[PDB]
Design a protein around this ligand. Structure first.
Ligand SMILES: COC(=O)N1CCC(Oc2cccc([C@@H](CC#N)Nc3nc4n(n3)C(=O)CC(C)=N4)c2)CC1
Ligand SMILES: COC(=O)N1CCC(Oc2cccc([C@@H](CC#N)Nc3nc4n(n3)C(=O)CC(C)=N4)c2)CC1
Ligand SMILES: COC(=O)N1CCC(Oc2cccc([C@@H](CC#N)Nc3nc4n(n3)C(=O)CC(C)=N4)c2)CC1
Ligand SMILES: COC(=O)N1CCC(Oc2cccc([C@@H](CC#N)Nc3nc4n(n3)C(=O)CC(C)=N4)c2)CC1
Ligand SMILES: COC(=O)N1CCC(Oc2cccc([C@@H](CC#N)Nc3nc4n(n3)C(=O)CC(C)=N4)c2)CC1
Ligand SMILES: COC(=O)N1CCC(Oc2cccc([C@@H](CC#N)Nc3nc4n(n3)C(=O)CC(C)=N4)c2)CC1
Lengths: 157, 160, 160, 157, 160, 157
């Protein structure tokens, strides 16, 4: 059973670590898939985001970190994945996830969208919120893996 | 991994929305327990025996579904059944809010039970057993939203 | 086009929020049926006869409003009345969710009945008949939210 | 009875066709009004969006497609429209529509905002979602009128 | 400014979520009235005397909290108590919608009473007295969500 | 008791005047704090926004208008404020406010986030909505203090 956990992960947070960890306890192999997403002008390049997520998930033996520029549904089919993992946060996210899931069901009917709920600890966090706090020199050590926190400080320095 | 998943609810009666969710669950987990609550807060339209018999007949074509009644705390029953995945459907915002509140409570009760939310077909996202019962009680056509055996049982129930 | 619109509900009692919606509906459709549900799920504070009489007096200044009681499925009554437009007010998110679920059900029941959502004045967006009744029962001033005849009937009802 | 159905329609989808069709069954004349909206940098020019919507609604005899750069409420008054049609989709849209409706009621009290619900078939779709799928080469033929699907493929080619 | 704030509710029973909110309120206002509704719509699990005694013992460490029962309209009681601040907790969207509707009503009833919304710790955002009671009734562990005296009273109540 | 009311206030509206007035009836001293926010490309410079808010709140004796580029929580600590005022509007805002409040509680546990509800009169308005109406020449005199309405007309002229 293969699952894909896609997103921009700019950068990967403890919220994302929590969701991917939960996914590895349910599925034999989890592909953490990072969207190149040039249109959103990410803070970190695709190569940097992949390296950070690789280092942050190295302790999980059944996680594979990959980058993609393809249509989500085509990438999932090409990874032989039948499960798509997304974390639920707020109503805006939930409504957007429902749009993506109905669209993905039209593109790949056998790809099942599965929603996980992160720990209360990471419910309110996002990569954007952590970057905004960090841009104004606020302490974000609690919200990120060690390697990511160092890379974020270095990027803003 | 040989995963055991639980899909709990009152299923009063089981609808095509429930069939959709349980079918999706059987496609990703080895064994699915469709768990029927014995004693809901409000008296159900269908007795537990009727709910269990309707759900069994409506899921008989799914080889890895087991329909079982339960009266314990859902998490206590899931633990006893060795289920490590809890399945719930999410139709709209109202569901999202309530299901998130239940998921945090269940994680406190049974941390090893993972809550997994699936989304039903657009065809069933606006239906619930309550809405179907209300429409049928008030003389509206609900045939499209139910398995045939449930449509037959509901007509018989409303006729008396 | 000579459109017939239906504005259904329990109207227990009719409030200034309902007056606002029905007034807007009369400005866009030739004939509006303000349809009162005979037998709601919970016993209403006002009997059907009181609800109909209050609604008639409160809308008497609107020439193209007809107040009528109904006990059938709302869509069955709309079809029988030759109404092709169903009017509902949308106050907040809770309304939006429930009304969308009802609209999909009604489209299945009567595809030729179009659901049209109107938004009340900011003055009435936070009120409901239930909230007005709860405030008045607990000795709060609700005069501003009701037509004069309803204010009189509610005071008489609570006095006994 | 004249109704106006405004929006950016960049490009017009089957969701928009469904709403305008429902509007023509209720009102004698429907103006489908396209906002020039240069600030949002549309994919299609105003002239292209008007031509696409004209072709896609040609089978509906009581639809008139026009472009506008004016304040919505002023344009509606100048079209002798007393009804404003909007389709409801998600909570974010509904909350935004409520803000526009209260603002429009202050600018033109006699302009009644009317909300329609699209078919379940088009509930999750938007022009942005269709463009995003198409930008990554996903099949969007189901979601658009034929002429629009050809114009979108051509624009991205 | 010597502000008097009111924190009203049914508190059936008082939870750690309520303790969190009242503690935050005591940190910003000179005096806080934790106001307990005498006669809720549905019969409470705990009598008013039990709710008041539990709330008093659970807030005894807060020097500027006064626990009082009330049966009037909340705004009428707040006016009589010279409270100018009304405290309510906001956990999620469902709360936000209902609390906004209540706040507009209270502003109409008592314009000089300002509604102030506080947000509880992440630890209690998914809990309510109703959810705690439902979990405990169905044999689930709720010790973490309650003050010790409430945990003791709830176990005694469910045992009989 | 000192409270801080932060935001971008680009420009300050009657919705903001209503919230700050309510705040001054509850707290001895209210700091209305304007975020420099260059990343959002505000219509008005920080100096213009501060001058407008100063003039619009001059009739309230216990309001101090200041600009800031710092992390919110650090600015509040440095102002000796223990209360943070935010107005509630829509679900999107409420969900975003909950994220900020949990983040601020991690950065400054003693800073209590307090939410006020504006008058029904200003519930649907925002600085963005007023600017959008004004950009298309719609009458926004009802929604802004006199000095702000003049400055907005002048800026767009
Ligand atoms: C259920 O999950 C998803 O459906 N996702 C896809 C969107 C998003 O990840 C991105 C973000 C930016 C760009 C991309 C690009 C690849 C690059 N570069 N592919 C892509 N495929 C899509 N896209 N975009 C959509 O916008 C909508 C859709 C149904 N399919 C993905 C989250 C994951
Ligand atoms: C995530 O799902 C859920 O959390 N479930 C449980 C609630 C509900 O199924 C019911 C309905 C009625 C009664 C019951 C009874 C058994 C009987 N008879 N057990 C039960 N277990 C609970 N209960 N009640 C709650 O009230 C809350 C909670 C967290 N756990 C279950 C849906 C499934
Ligand atoms: C879009 O509006 C609605 O859908 N309406 C119908 C529900 C409600 O008005 C009531 C209330 C109580 C009872 C009734 C009774 C008549 C009596 N007595 N008919 C009725 N028709 C229904 N009903 N119930 C439902 O429960 C659901 C549904 C889709 N159609 C109507 C609001 C209007
Ligand atoms: C109820 O509908 C609406 O109220 N609408 C207006 C907004 C939107 O269509 C646009 C989009 C971009 C720009 C425009 C421009 C024209 C161009 N170019 N006119 C315009 N008039 C407005 N605008 N913007 C607002 O932002 C708010 C408001 C109350 N009135 C319209 C949807 C329709
Ligand atoms: C903003 O808070 C609130 O608005 N409150 C009031 C409601 C509720 O506390 C109750 C619960 C049950 C009964 C009561 C009784 C007293 C007894 N017994 N008074 C009361 N006052 C009200 N009531 N009911 C309403 O139904 C609506 C309203 C605006 N004001 C209060 C929460 C606090
Ligand atoms: C509860 O309120 C808030 O928490 N606020 C902060 C965000 C927002 O005001 C801004 C807007 C733009 C930029 C800024 C800059 C200063 C400049 N320039 N400081 C800042 N501090 C933050 N920021 N951003 C975040 O994005 C998130 C966060 C928890 N703290 C503030 C509203 C107030």
């Amino acid at each position: 059973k293969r699952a894909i956990y896609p997103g921009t992960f700019d950068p990967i947070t403890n919220g994302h670590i929590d969701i991917v960890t939960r996914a590895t306890q349910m599925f034999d192999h989890v592909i953490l898939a990072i969207a190149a997403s040039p249109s959103k002008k990410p803070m970190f390049t695709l190569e940097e985001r992949v390296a950070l997520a690789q280092q942050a998930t190295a302790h999980l033996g059944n996680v594979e970190v990959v980058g993609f520029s393809d249509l989500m549904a085509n990438f999932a089919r090409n990874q032989h994945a039948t499960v798509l993992i997304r974390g639920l946060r707020a109503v805006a996210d939930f409504e957007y996830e429902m749009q993506l899931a109905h669209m993905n069901r039209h593109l790949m009917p056998e790809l099942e969208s599965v929603f996980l709920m992160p720990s209360k600890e990471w419910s309110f966090i996002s990569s954007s919120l952590v970057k905004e706090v960090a841009r104004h020199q606020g302490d974000v050590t609690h919200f990120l893996p060690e390697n990511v926190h160092q890379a974020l400080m270095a990027k803003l320095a």
